Design a protein around this ligand. Structure first.
Ligand code: MG
Ligand code: MG
Ligand code: MG
Ligand code: MG
Ligand code: MG
Ligand code: MG
Ligand code: MG
Ligand code: MG
Ligand code: MG
Ligand code: MG
Ligand code: MG
Ligand code: MG
Ligand code: MG
Ligand code: MG
Ligand code: MG
Ligand code: MG
Ligand code: MG
Ligand code: MG
Ligand code: MG
Ligand code: MG
Ligand code: MG
Ligand code: MG
Ligand code: MG
Ligand code: MG
Ligand code: MG
Ligand code: MG
Ligand code: MG
Ligand code: MG
Ligand code: MG
Ligand code: MG
Ligand code: MG
Ligand code: MG
Ligand code: MG
Ligand code: MG
Ligand code: MG
Ligand code: MG
Ligand code: MG
Ligand code: MG
Ligand code: MG
Ligand code: MG
Ligand code: MG
Lengths: 110, 386
RNA sequence: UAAGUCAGAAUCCAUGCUGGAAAGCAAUGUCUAAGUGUGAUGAUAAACGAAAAAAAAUAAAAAUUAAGUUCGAAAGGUAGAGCGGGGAAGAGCGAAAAAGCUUGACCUUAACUGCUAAUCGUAAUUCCAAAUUAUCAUCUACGUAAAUCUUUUGUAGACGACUUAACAUGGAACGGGUAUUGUAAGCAUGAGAGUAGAAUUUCCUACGAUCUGCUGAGAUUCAGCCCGUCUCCUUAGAUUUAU
RNA sequence: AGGUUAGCAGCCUCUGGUCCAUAGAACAAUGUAGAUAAGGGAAGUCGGCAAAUUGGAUCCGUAACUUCGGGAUAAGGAUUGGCUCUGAGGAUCUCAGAACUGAAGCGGACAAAGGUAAUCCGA
RNA sequence: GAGUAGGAGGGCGUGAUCGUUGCCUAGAAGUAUUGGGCGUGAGCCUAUAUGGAGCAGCGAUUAGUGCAGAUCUUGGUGGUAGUAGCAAAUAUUCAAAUGAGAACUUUGAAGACCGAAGUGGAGAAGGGUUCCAUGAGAACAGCAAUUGUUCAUGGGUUACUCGA
RNA sequence: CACGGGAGACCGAUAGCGAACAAGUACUGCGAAGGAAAGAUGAAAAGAACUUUGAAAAGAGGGCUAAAAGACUUGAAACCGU
């Protein structure tokens, strides 16, 4: 196997992922949930959550969380001086009108 | 102190200790009394808990509150897909009890059953039964069967639950002993042989208005407080540590606690042999009519609108029992015949079914069929299709 | 009733039922690389014929008062002899804990014959069999099957444990179904108590809760609902047992 | 300081300050705190302990007893939103009417008495 | 040929003093011993190892002279046990930077709290340098720390009208 | 009792004055008053040069010295690891 830079668009379902989580912990837990989906998907132990994505998660406060997020998973070469993994994953917030048509897909060239 | 007011004890001791079970599918530790009367019959069968619905029947039972009137009763549907037969097993009677003399395997043992021997089929070279295949000599088999004829008291069929017929996660079949009751050892054997590599249907075994036994595992409730477990009366709500305790673990002497006093612990996941459940219907997964009645005269399948909750659609055949039986939906169950054939009233009662409810259980459903919901809302799906 | 017989209880024992790590037993699937591999040292509440198969009856019989029997029993050698003893394969039979019995390539041995015994010095276990198995060392084989952790399921769960999945009938996301709420936003040359202004004098305009239509709408629906999917992720690593 | 309000109450805000209280995951029993239970209604218990009911404002209506002050929110009965209009009180912000409109709801959070009849003490 | 309370006769072992006989940098005292022995027993002698400066016998003299205990004194240590536990005062999250290391430091971006009866701005009592800046190993800040009310070094408190 | 002298069948760091030592000290108490613990590297600092791995503590090499005796003489028991 070779490991290459990858990117994947996916709707994380916070209604589902965060379901029945104690109130004061919802928002934060939504984040951990995203971060784990990053790991499982890209196989990177270094995940980075874009500011905007965070902002959007929290956009409703802690209790009540947006029920769906459209996210881009970026896998990129770790070009740093101190280098542990060859790669890191950026989680990016994509703005959508209706989540209703979406699938998980390889990000498309536009 | 002679205890102040006398009430019965707080659980049946015959049901203890209360720990979980080893037997996951049913284990019948008795098969019905064997009689020479009838040709060899197959003792029990395996099925899965699908859902419940209710029925409207008419009662012919004389002397009853309900004679000649419509009753509505609760019912459980158990999907009963065909079982496959794999082997034969002879048992010898020894002074230390019964013993397995031998097991005669067929040529055909399908992958899923082989799964039984493995924890994961796909990471294994799937080596099971290979030698039984390449070395297979029909002569020897016949020799073994003759052996069993010679030395054996009891004969049982090794049986195969084919899980591939259902939609559930578990595809790994089930491997049962179903004992064979019939007059002469020899004929038992002949019968057993006739069965090998074939499929047995529930009709082969259970009839309608027949009385049933259901063997299986109670739903697990986990670690249980004493109130939930044995149903103690709760202590005064004013009590300092808490009130969900029993008050007195025991008197001074004896210096220890008896096995009799109730305590915390596991509730749920036990094995129960439940007796005398009535068969209201047995039906073929082929009839799209199978859920309807003489009184209904319209197409109905037992599967409720939107499907049995937490179970699925029932495509296979099934038995429909009066009342409820042990365990959560999807628990496999072993339906065994009554130890002694039941002669009492409820058992003689001929059952006249009028309504079988196909109404959705996911909510409070008022529709018996899609066609109904659609007529009501003026959406024809046959129209959208066209 | 003493022998001998019948009836006979919510009793007793069973049957049924739940446990069943009884440091019990059986049947069956696969594997145990390489040899009926060898060497040394060892342990086993007890090897020196530590010998031995009728069945039943004790007020039976024609008749026998004791396993107070019977069988085996030569040199802990060699060379011959060979009464006799033991048994491959395969084929037979044999199951209460299958312990073995038959046949049988062949392997072996007693009388008898010759050597050899003595200096193990008037005793000091007569150290050798059989069934088991430990340890160390080594020769050949560098393989085979399976499990576990890092995953998965929620029929299970305090944690362990348990049911179940393993490149996809899995997980994700999505489509449809079923269901809950109760008719979303936005429009309306539709209705609306009544007010104000323009307009022309039986109207226009503005404001207006609310009604009505578009709309049984909109929203949500597995995280332990159901059916389905073009798409996305999982094919790697470590560990354990037989070694 | 602003909004609500009788209010320096409560609830929400601006200025200024702060997120400091070891953390992660699971979600059993038992517990600490918080709520809700069909039918009955103290049968529970030494005991209504605890809980529940009541609660603002406007309009009605208001006993015995009495030291004539009181009792007194006695007891009890109603109303409360929104919207569209109408009238009255004043200088060189209160009060009252009418009509229309809703799942007959409207002190919608917050705030906020449960009554009655007797007996004993102490004014 | 018994023996508690009790009494008597002999003996073991420890300081110091007057004598007497001696031993030790060619290794005294002390210490450890599954080395070898001696006493019925107090106790003894030796061997080996360690140790690195004082010791020992015999006759007398003298005694702060022998410990298993007294909820005994002081000191040192266990098991419990990686256990009970670290849960009041609603709350945190993302990226960058710094660093060996960041849930706990700094900037920014979000979300909440105290809600002018404050988690705000200043005083009296009490504290006394805790204030400011730079730096930082251990300890302390009951997790952590690159941070500090902690450590180190330097520097800060001006009055006719304020108060005494 | 104070400053001096000399001495002893005294005591010998849990003993001897409470204090062998920054001891009537640290510390406590509004106060009157209470009041400890704490002595021995070596003949000489010769107190561990230098190499190496570490962010650092430190380890491994290497060295002083009669000996590491290295925060220090001897180094018992309880307790703990191999
Ligand atoms: Mg880094
Ligand atoms: Mg860096
Ligand atoms: Mg009883
Ligand atoms: Mg049985
Ligand atoms: Mg129950
Ligand atoms: Mg407790
Ligand atoms: Mg009888
Ligand atoms: Mg009895
Ligand atoms: Mg209009
Ligand atoms: Mg969906
Ligand atoms: Mg979850
Ligand atoms: Mg699905
Ligand atoms: Mg926590
Ligand atoms: Mg109630
Ligand atoms: Mg009532
Ligand atoms: Mg009621
Ligand atoms: Mg009360
Ligand atoms: Mg009055
Ligand atoms: Mg009133
Ligand atoms: Mg009154
Ligand atoms: Mg009104
Ligand atoms: Mg009015
Ligand atoms: Mg009205
Ligand atoms: Mg109300
Ligand atoms: Mg009262
Ligand atoms: Mg008073
Ligand atoms: Mg002395
Ligand atoms: Mg020397
Ligand atoms: Mg002596
Ligand atoms: Mg020496
Ligand atoms: Mg003397
Ligand atoms: Mg002593
Ligand atoms: Mg002592
Ligand atoms: Mg302790
Ligand atoms: Mg606590
Ligand atoms: Mg604070
Ligand atoms: Mg302040
Ligand atoms: Mg200040
Ligand atoms: Mg060193
Ligand atoms: Mg030395
Ligand atoms: Mg030890």
């Amino acid at each position: 196997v070779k490991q290459e830079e990858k990117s994947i668009d996916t709707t994380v379902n916070l209604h589902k992922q965060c379901h029945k989580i104690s109130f004061k912990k919802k928002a934060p837990r939504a984040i951990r949930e995203i971060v784990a989906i990053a790991k499982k998907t890209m196989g990177t132990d270094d995940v980075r959550i874009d500011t905007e994505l965070n902002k959007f998660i929290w956009s409703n406060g802690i209790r009540n969380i947006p029920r769906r997020v459209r996210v881009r998973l970026c896998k990129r070469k770790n070009e740093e001086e101190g280098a542990q993994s060859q790669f890191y994953t950026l989680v990016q917030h994509l703005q959508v009108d209706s989540y209703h048509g979406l699938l998980t897909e390889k990000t498309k060239a536009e | 102190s002679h205890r102040k007011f006398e009430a019965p004890r707080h659980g049946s001791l015959g049901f203890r200790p209360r720990r979980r079970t080893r037997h996951h599918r049913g284990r019948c530790r008795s098969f019905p009394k064997d009689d020479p009367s009838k040709k060899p019959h197959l003792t029990a069968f395996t099925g899965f808990k699908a859902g419940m619905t209710h029925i409207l029947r008419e009662v012919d039972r004389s002397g009853s509150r309900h004679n000649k009137k419509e009753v509505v009763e609760a019912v459980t549907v158990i999907e009963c897909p065909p079982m496959t037969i794999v082997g034969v097993v002879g048992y010898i009677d020894t002074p230390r009890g019964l013993r397995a003399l031998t097991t005669v395997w067929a040529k055909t043992i399908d992958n899923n059953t082989k799964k039984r021997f493995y924890k994961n089929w796909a990471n294994s070279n799937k080596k099971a039964f290979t030698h039984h295949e390449k070395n297979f000599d029909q002569k020897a088999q016949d020799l073994l069967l003759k052996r069993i004829e010679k030395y054996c008291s009891v004969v049982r069929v090794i049986a195969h639950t084919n899980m591939s017929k259902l939609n559930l996660r578990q595809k790994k079949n089930h491997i049962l002993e179903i004992q064979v009751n019939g007059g002469k050892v020899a004929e038992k054997v002949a019968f057993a042989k006739s069965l090998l590599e074939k499929e047995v249907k529930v009709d082969s075994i259970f009839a309608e208005n027949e009385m049933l036994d259901v063997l299986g595992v109670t739903k697990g409730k986990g670690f249980a407080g004493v109130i939930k477990r044995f149903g103690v009366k709760h202590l005064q709500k004013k009590t300092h540590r808490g009130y969900r305790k029993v008050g007195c673990i025991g008197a001074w002497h004896p210096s220890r606690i008896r096995f009799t006093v109730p305590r915390a612990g596991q509730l749920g996941y036990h094995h129960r042999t439940e007796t005398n459940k009535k068969v209201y219907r047995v039906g073929k997964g082929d009839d799209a009519s199978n859920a309807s009645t003489a009184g209904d005269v319209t197409d109905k399948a037992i599967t409720p609108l939107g499907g049995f909750p937490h179970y699925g659609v029932v495509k296979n055949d099934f038995i429909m029992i009066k009342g409820c039986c042990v365990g959560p939906k999807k628990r496999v169950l072993t339906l065994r015949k009554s130890i002694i054939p039941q002669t009492h009233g409820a058992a003689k009662e001929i059952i006249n079914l009028k309504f079988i409810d196909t109404s959705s259980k996911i909510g409070h459903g008022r529709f018996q069929t899609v066609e109904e919901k659609d007529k009501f809302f003026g959406r024809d799906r046959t129209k959208k299709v066209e």
